[PDB]
Design a protein around this ligand. Structure first.
Ligand code: NA
Ligand code: NA
Ligand code: NA
Ligand code: NA
Lengths: 445, 445
């Protein structure tokens, strides 16, 4: 009776159809049919992203592709735990309120100027997003933005207070491209191609550094009248209490080890997934240092995303084991050789940057990273490029709301028009397809 | 400065001490030192049960016992997922309110008699606990019990309204011994020795059936004046709405497949951990049937317990790999042959039934099931007996509160005395040591 119940039944139909009608070796048929089935369920979101994730192994198992335990073992990949470490690290500094103090201390550095208020509001939202979340960084920023844009209250003077709203919802999404913790897509790429924390930063941090100015520039040079206004610094000030310095200290130490993981680990006996150990170490230090309780981490952690990671890896393995990766490689063989590597990575970048407007950031990564990385491997090319690309572009949702929660958070502020966002994002999309295809060409040799 | 911070440092000291001073082959020393370290941390609970759980692999890995990924793979054991299925199954019928209707419909079957009120209150708390939880079943029952014992309000007439309070807190714990979902210890035993759902029910359901009458009898024949009183059936009645029949239907179907897993699976091609597939199948049916949202399951699920399971399995493997299981087998060799199998299982049953009063139900199972099952295996005896025993006995906390949350839930009802509980439990403990050692002898050949 419901929309989604039908999408599911139409997908069950589609599967059954593809299954019986495709004219290939049995494994490829099964692999293709499953790919389509999942593809639909993640893009439509007829079932919850995480329920679909769980659907992957239970199919794999019933269709004899894997044994139950083999399939499940995916959900215990070391990146999954690295991400759970980053969740606990966030939980700590939120419960501790170290996110508020980093906001106040930087925001009140700007004395009383709306010019240097919004510019510091974007610079914080981005720096906080590197470690925290997107949905979380955005929802935490909204009250602090509405606090500032209350002195220039005239909402017949909209474009002042739309620039600073749309500004953070993008700064949250762009800041999420800086490190391996931040936005799930990054983690899905890292789990797929086997990246370290310090690996993904060598890619993303440059891209975030480039894209934040470029995005502010584009919002600016549409309609900004904000070189005017004054501050209302209205609320109780902040102060470092029972080891907000400790939470910072652990955080600093953790982030330090993540960066210097390569020499530190090598000069320790070369442990296997060092970054993950550092991440689990963080959870231990944070608990021994009494600084955060476990009930907190259990609330903060998006276990649904952690389960998603696994289902996506399971999918990747279903494609390999059924030879569907090799089959598509053969099928695209003539096409990709008739295209350039420029042409390809332009098509890819474009495709996702717009697909991510209609569907979930991570759901899109969870579908496309496996398909592309595994096909790239059948071509015997390093799957890293295509994977990192997809993950960055999947976090480039700038048009409508519903694209990301950050977009829909500043939108519910009952002010910003549907039409307005749809055209700043349309420029910023292309702007990125440029920047990405640009950078993706430079990171080659 | 805090109590627990010291326990930790004293434990770190103890480890360091044992590590340097024990006069054995290196692996045994490391294995023993770790066993002690963990043993302390789980019994004291200086660190959260779950943080200690995470501490297991991170040690194993740093001390070269396992590779990071190998150690982590433990957290994806198929029983872990079976238990997550049971969490989602509970989440469904609570959000749906099917637990309330099963309470009302059975409670209002008793017309207006306090005699047949409390007797049906225990019979429900037990039947609900089989599937739901203990902490959850107890906290859900408290308002329904205080609702009944408000007509005999005279609390100078205490022993009427203490019998019916202490009664449910035990019915919740006893009902948790009926099936593999219910109380974590059961799952830790099942993961260790490789039990199916229908396996653990063949053991526990008999034991729950026996122990519930035996426990009521003991509370009764201390001070019961409850053959008197009348009902206040005060609140809005219940009615089957948007598929509370569906939730029941799925539940029934799920529980059906779990029972008949053996012939159904055999007549399907013999899939690997069928019960787990059924459990994950439940999560899918419940989502397709739209009957429960994922945000619900994410709140309901005790991810901390799911992580605990893994840490415990990891420990078990640390004992095997270091040969600490074989070493203790050799060390207890002369003692266990000088004892009977009666003597042993009497000592075991006694030991836990009283240990579980001072420390966490599952934390105790997580420590003792590995140690015993692995030592039993070094003696080349089926580890099932000792494991199932420990898991049942670990759920036999009847003395002080703080033993289980169910005990401390009816206790905060500002009425029941410390002294009172401590002596009904002391009888019931021995009563069980009897019943268990009894039953444990019968389930032999
Ligand atoms: Na982020
Ligand atoms: Na999106
Ligand atoms: Na239970
Ligand atoms: Na206990």
């Amino acid at each position: 009776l419901h929309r989604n119940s039908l999408i599911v039944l139409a997908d069950v139909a589609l599967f059954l159809a593809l299954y019986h009608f495709l004219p290939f070796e049995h494994n490829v048929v099964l692999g293709i049919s499953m790919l389509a089935f999942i593809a639909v369920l993640w893009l439509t979101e007829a079932l919850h992203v995480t329920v679909t994730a769980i659907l992957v192994p239970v199919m794999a198992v019933f269709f004899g592709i894997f044994e139950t335990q083999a399939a499940l073992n995916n959900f215990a990949n070391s990146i999954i735990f690295l991400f759970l470490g980053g969740f606990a690290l966030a939980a700590a500094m939120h419960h501790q309120g170290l996110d508020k103090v980093i906001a106040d201390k930087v925001l009140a550095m700007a004395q009383g100027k709306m010019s240097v208020a919004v510019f510091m509001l974007f610079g914080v939202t981005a720096l906080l997003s590197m470690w925290i979340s997107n949905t979380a960084t955005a929802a935490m920023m909204l009250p602090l933005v509405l606090g500032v844009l209350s002195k220039v209250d005239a909402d017949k003077q909209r474009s002042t207070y739309v620039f600073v709203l749309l500004g953070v919802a993008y700064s949250a999404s762009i800041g999420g491209i800086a490190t391996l913790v931040g936005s799930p897509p990054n983690a899905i790429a890292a789990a797929e191609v086997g990246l370290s924390f310090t690996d993904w930063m060598k890619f993303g941090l440059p891209t975030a550094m480039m894209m934040l100015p470029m995005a502010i520039a584009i919002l600016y040079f549409l309609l900004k009248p904000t070189l005017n206004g004054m501050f209302e610094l209205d609320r109780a000030p902040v102060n470092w209490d029972k080891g907000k310095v400790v939470t910072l200290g652990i955080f600093g130490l953790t982030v330090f080890l993540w960066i210097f993981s390569s020499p530190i680990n090598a000069a320790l006996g070369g442990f296997k997934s060092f970054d993950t150990l550092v991440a689990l170490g963080a959870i231990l230090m944070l608990s021994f240092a009494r600084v955060v309780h476990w009930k907190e981490i259990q609330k903060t952690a998006d276990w649904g995303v952690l389960l998603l990671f696994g289902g996506g890896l399971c999918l990747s393995n279903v494609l390999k084991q059924t030879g569907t990766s090799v089959f598509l490689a053969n099928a695209l063989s003539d096409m990709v050789s008739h295209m350039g590597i420029f042409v390809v990575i332009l098509v890819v970048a474009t495709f996702v940057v717009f697909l991510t407007e209609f569907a979930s950031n991570t759901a899109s990564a969870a579908l496309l990273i496996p398909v592309f990385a595994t096909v790239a491997e059948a071509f015997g090319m390093s799957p890293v490029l295509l994977s990192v690309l997809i993950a960055v572009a999947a976090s480039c949702a700038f048009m409508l709301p519903v694209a990301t929660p950050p977009n829909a958070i500043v939108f519910a502020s009952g002010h910003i028009k549907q039409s307005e966002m749809m055209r700043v994002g349309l420029y910023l999309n292309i702007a990125c397809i440029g920047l990405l295809t640009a950078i993706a060409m430079l990171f080659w040799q």
